[PDB]
Amino acid sequence: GSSGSSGIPRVFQNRFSTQYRCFSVSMLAGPNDRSDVEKGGKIIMPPSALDQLSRLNITYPMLFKLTNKNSDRMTHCGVLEFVADEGICYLPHWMMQNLLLEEGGLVQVESVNLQVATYSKFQPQSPDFLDITNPKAVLENALRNFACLTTGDVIAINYNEKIYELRVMETKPDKAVSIIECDMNVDFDA
Numbered sequence: 001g002s003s004g005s006s007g008i009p010r011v012f013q014n015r016f017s018t019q020y021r022c023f024s025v026s027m028l029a030g031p032n033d034r035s036d037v038e039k040g041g042k043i044i045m046p047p048s049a050l051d052q053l054s055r056l057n058i059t060y061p062m063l064f065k066l067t068n069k070n071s072d073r074m075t076h077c078g079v080l081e082f083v084a085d086e087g088i089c090y091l092p093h094w095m096m097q098n099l100l101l102e103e104g105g106l107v108q109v110e111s112v113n114l115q116v117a118t119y120s121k122f123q124p125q126s127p128d129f130l131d132i133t134n135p136k137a138v139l140e141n142a143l144r145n146f147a148c149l150t151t152g153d154v155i156a157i158n159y160n161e162k163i164y165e166l167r168v169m170e171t172k173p174d175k176a177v178s179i180i181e182c183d184m185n186v187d188f189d190a
Contacts, residue, residue: 042080
């Protein structure tokens, strides 16, 4: 109920919808920096998120819709652990570079429920991956870690001590999907 509408809101029903400050994972406490986290599609939201989602009547899966209002970017990720600071959401590094955001950048978040994908096309940004004799095995072995995927999401993977840049070209049925234990077909575009 406001007179202005900067981004033309559209939230009325009962669900989680707000902005959060995107930060790096290394910023988190601890003597060393976790790398396994970056090698996947999992983030960390404040404990308050758990209490809210619990009252919003939202069950698994629980994916969010990160809509970047800086370059019309869009990426759907999934929460893993609920142990972060207030007003300081911790997210991977690949998500930051893809969105081109900055330390403490507010991004529109929405709790959306998607389904598994039937057809997902990938397009290796770097020739390193294309050089691989078995790109499917490498992409399928890393995809197991990812929980969500969007059309045009520059997702980075690591296994042989190397970060292979991979960007999705097409996905089904919709742009955002939730690959949580299922059988789909991965195509290529090169």
